[PDB]
Amino acid sequence: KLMHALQYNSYGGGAAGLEHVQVPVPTPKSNEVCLKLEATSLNPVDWKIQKGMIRPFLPRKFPCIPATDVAGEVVEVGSGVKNFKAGDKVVAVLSHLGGGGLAEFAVATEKLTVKRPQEVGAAEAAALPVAGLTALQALTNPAGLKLDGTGKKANILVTAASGGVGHYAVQLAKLANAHVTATCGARNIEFVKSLGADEVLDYKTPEGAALKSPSGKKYDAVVHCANGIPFSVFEPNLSENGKVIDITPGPNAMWTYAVKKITMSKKQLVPLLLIPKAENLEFMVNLVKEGKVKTVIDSKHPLSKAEDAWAKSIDGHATGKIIVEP
Amino acid sequence: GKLMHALQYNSYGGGAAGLEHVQVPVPTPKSNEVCLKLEATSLNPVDWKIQKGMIRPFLPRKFPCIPATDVAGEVVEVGSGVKNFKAGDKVVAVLSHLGGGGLAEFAVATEKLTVKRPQEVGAAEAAALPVAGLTALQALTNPAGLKLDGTGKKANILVTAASGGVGHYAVQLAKLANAHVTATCGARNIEFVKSLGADEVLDYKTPEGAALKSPSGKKYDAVVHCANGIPFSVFEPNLSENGKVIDITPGPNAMWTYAVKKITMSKKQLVPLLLIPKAENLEFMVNLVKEGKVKTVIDSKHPLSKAEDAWAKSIDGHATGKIIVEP
C-alpha cells in the first residue's frame, strides 16, 4: 500500500521545493509503533534543516519527508512493543529528528510515544513535543524553576513570546510563579498578556530593542526564542549570575558558549539542546488535560496543502503552533 | 612603582619568536585577590593556541598579553577582603579568565582560585597541576562518572596522547578509580606510560594504534581524548554501547558536532570538556600529590629569562608531562 507525503530533495528549495508524493507505508521495527497520523505540527528547525543550517548531518538522506511532532492512532506495533496496541491514541516525537511527519503514516519508537487522553485533541497534542519540551527543559534545568509551589522566585524574560516555544514558556513560567517579561510585535501584545505575562515589550520600540523591563527588573534567566541579539544587549538586563538560554543554537552560539564558560563569566549563555523524554511529554500532556497549559493553534492545513503551512512556518509570524492534518 | 620581568606577545600568530622580554609594573591586588611572588609556572597547550588565534577575538582581552595561568608561589600582599591568606603563605593558583599573567615574577590570583601549598609539595610539581590535572579530574569524574575510591564497578578507559600533560594525569587518576586503562603514545614513551600504570599501551604509528584497537578486545566506556585529528568514526567501533568520547580542548567544530549528536540522540556521545576550575578540586589534587597517589611528571624546567625555549617546547607538542618556567 502507498501513502501521501511531502518531501524535499535537496537543500534550499523552501516551500516551492516541497513536493507531493506517494511512498510506501512504513513497517515498524520491533521497538516501534506505526501511527495513522491525525495531526502534525511544524517547528522552525524543520525548515532550517531544509535551508541547510545543519548540513551535512541532516537530513541523513534525500529525499526527506520533514517534521517530527505528531499525534495519531496506533495501527501496527513492532514485536517488542508492550505498552501500546492497535487503536491507542498517542502523541509522539519522531526519531533522531529525521522527519516522517508530513505523511499519512509514521513510525515512532515506543520510548518517544505517550498516551493521548480523550480530553486532549490531536492537534493540541501534536503541538506539544518539540516546542513544549524545549520550554519545559529551559525553565526546569538551566533556569532551575519548580512547577509546583516549591520553587525559587525568579524574573524571567521570554523573547519572541508569541511563537511556538515562547507561548509555552510564558505559561510554564507563570506556573513556576516567576515574574514574566515578554517581547513580541505590536499585533501580539494583547495575546501575550493573555498568556499571563506580567510585562510586554514591543520589540520595535527602543525599550523593546533594549529588553528594558518597565519596572526595572533584572532577569535571572532568558528563554531566548528570538534571533539577532548580541549578548551585549542582554548583559546589563541580567542579574548578577543571570543566564541567556539560547533556543535552537547554531555553530556560533555553541562556540560563544564554550569560551564564556571557559573564561568563567558570571553571566552565562546557555544553549538549549533538547533531550525529549516520555515522562516530560506525559507531564506536558497532563498539564494540557488539566487546562493549566493552553495549546494555541496558529492555523490548520490539510496534508494536500501542507506547503502553505511550511510557507507560514518559514515566514516566522505564527502565533502559537502551525498544524498539518493528518 | 617597582618593575618586574615578564614575557608578552603583541599580536596573533608570532609563535615563540613573537614572545618578548619586558619590564612591567608589579600588580596591585584587588580586594578579593592575593599578589604572588611566583616560584613556578606551567604551560598548557591552550596558552600558545590563544596566541595562534584559536580563540580570537575573545582572547586575549588585550594586547599585549603576558601568557600562562598555572602558578605556584608565595603570597606577598593581600587585598582588603582576603581572610584565608597572609603574607608568606605558599600557594598554588589558577590565574583568572585566561587573561594570562604567569610568565612574570609576580601575579595576582583571586582567593577563590588559590589553594594552600603544603610543605611536602614543591612549587614546580604544584604549578603543573591546575589546568592539566583538573581537566583530567573533571573528565573522569563527571562524564566518565568514575569514583576515586576504587569501589565503583570497573570501566574501560582510553587515554589518547597519554604522555602529555592532561594524558599523564588522566592515566594515573583512572587507575585510582580502578578502571582498566588503554593508552596511546609514541614509541619513545611507551615504557613511561606503562610506568604511569596503563594496562595496555598502543603506538599510535602502528595500524592498531591508529585504529585505537584494544589488544585484549576491550570496548571503551569513555575516552579522555587529548590527541588531535581523529574523526568520531575511528572511535565509534571501539566504544561500548553508550560510550563517550571526551574531547579535551574542543574547538568550534567539536562544539557544533557535540550539538548535533546530542540533538539526533546518538547513544555513543561526543562530550567536550569545558573546564570549571574549583578550589576544592585543586585542594583534592594537591593532596593526592602530597600522598604520592598522583605523581607530577616534569618534562623540563626553564628560567623566565629563557621562557621562549619553554614556549617553543610547548608549541612543538612532544612534552612528557608538564613544562615548567621558573618563576
Residue numbers in the entry:
A (entry chain A): 4 to 329
B (entry chain B): 3 to 329
Paper text:
The chloroplast envelope Quinone Oxidoreductase Homolog (ceQORH; At4g13010; molecular weight 34,034 Da) from Arabidopsis thaliana is associated to the inner membrane of the chloroplast envelope where it represents 1–2% of the crude envelope proteins. Despite its original annotation as a “QOR,” ceQORH is inactive on quinones but preferentially reduces γ-ketols in the presence of NADPH. γ-ketols are long-chain reactive electrophile oxylipins and are potentially toxic. The ceQORH monomer is formed of two domains with (i) the catalytic domain including residues from Gly3 to Pro132 and from Leu277 to Pro329 and (ii) the cofactor binding domain (Val133 to Leu276) showing the classical motif of Rossmann fold. In the ceQORH structure, the internal chloroplast targeting sequence is folded as a two anti-parallel β-strands (Thr71 to Gly81 and Asp91 to Leu97) connected by a long loop (Ser82 to Gly90).
In crystals of apo-ceQORH, the asymmetric unit contains two monomers related by a non-crystallographic two-fold axis that form a dimer. The monomers are very similar with a value of root mean square deviation (rmsd) of 0.25 Å between monomers. The buried area in the dimer interface is 2,410 Å2. In the apo-ceQORH dimer, interactions between monomers mainly involve residues in the α-helix Pro254-Met267 belonging to the cofactor binding domain. Each α-helix in the dimer contributes for 723 Å2 to the buried area, being 60% of the overall buried area at the dimer interface. In ceQORH, the residues (Thr251-Lys269) are folded in a loop-α-helix(Pro254-Met267)-loop. This α-helix interacts with the non-crystallographic symmetry related α-helix in the apo-ceQORH dimer. The orientation of the α-helix (Pro254-Met267) prevents the monomer of ceQORH to interact with another monomer to form a dimer similar to that observed in dimeric QORs. NADPH is always present in vivo and the dimeric apo-ceQORH probably never forms in cell. The apo-ceQORH monomer was used for searching homolog and comparisons with structures from the PDB using PDBefold.
